[PDB]
From Swiss-Prot, chain B:
It is found in: Secreted; Cell surface. This is Beta-2-microglobulin. The modification Pyrrolidone carboxylic acid is found at residue 3. Belongs to the beta-2-microglobulin family. It comes from Homo sapiens (Human). Disulfide bonds join 26-81. It comes from the Eukaryota.
Length: 100, 98
C-alpha cells in the first residue's frame, strides 16, 4: 500500500446537550501506514483516558481506527481531535461541530 | 528494545484431507511496530481472495493479525504465509505442513 493521509470525522454519539453525558468520537480512516497518534482535546488540552478500537481494513492495508470517550459538554467547553501521522508535517486539528 | 519480531503460525482449521473444503490460517502475533505485510501463498503465488481479522492491539503493547482463506487441498498444491516486518532482513516465508 502507498502512504495515505488520514481522513478525520469528529462526532458525538447522541444529539448534544449542555450538562448531559454523551460520547465524543474521532474516527480516522483511509490511512497508511498503521502507526498514528490521536488525542481528543478539551479546551486545547489532552483528555487522558480515551479508548480506541483495533485497526480495521478491507482488501488493502488502508486503515480505520476510532478513538472515543465519555464526556459532558458545557457552553464554555470546546472539543477537538488532534492527529499526527507520517504523512503529516504537523498535527492536524479538527474541531467538534456541536451539530454532529 | 520496543521492536518485536512476529511469531508466525500457519495451520489448517482441520487436518489435511485432499478434496474436502477447509480453511488455511496464518496467525501473526506478538509484533511491534504495527507496520506489517502478510500474504497467503498457493504455489508461491499470492492468493487474491482472502479474509482477515482486525490488526489488533494486545495488552502487552504488541499487535496481532489473522489471515485466513477457504481452500480445498490436493496432493500437488503447496501453501505458505509470507510476512514482511521491520525486524526481518527479508520477507519470511513459513510453509504449511499437513
Amino acid at each position: 500500500m502507498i502512504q495515505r493521509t488520514p481522513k478525520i470525522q469528529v462526532y458525538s454519539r447522541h444529539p448534544a446537550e449542555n450538562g448531559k453525558s454523551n460520547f465524543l468520537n474521532c474516527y480516522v480512516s483511509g490511512f497508511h501506514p498503521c502507526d498514528i497518534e490521536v488525542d481528543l482535546l478539551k479546551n486545547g488540552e489532552r483528555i487522558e483516558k480515551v479508548e480506541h478500537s483495533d485497526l480495521s481494513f478491507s482488501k488493502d492495508w488502508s486503515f480505520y481506527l476510532l478513538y472515543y470517550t465519555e464526556f459532558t459538554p458545557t457552553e464554555k467547553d470546546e472539543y477537538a481531535c488532534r492527529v499526527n501521522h507520517v504523512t503529516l508535517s504537523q498535527p492536524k486539528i479538527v474541531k467538534w461541530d456541536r451539530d454532529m
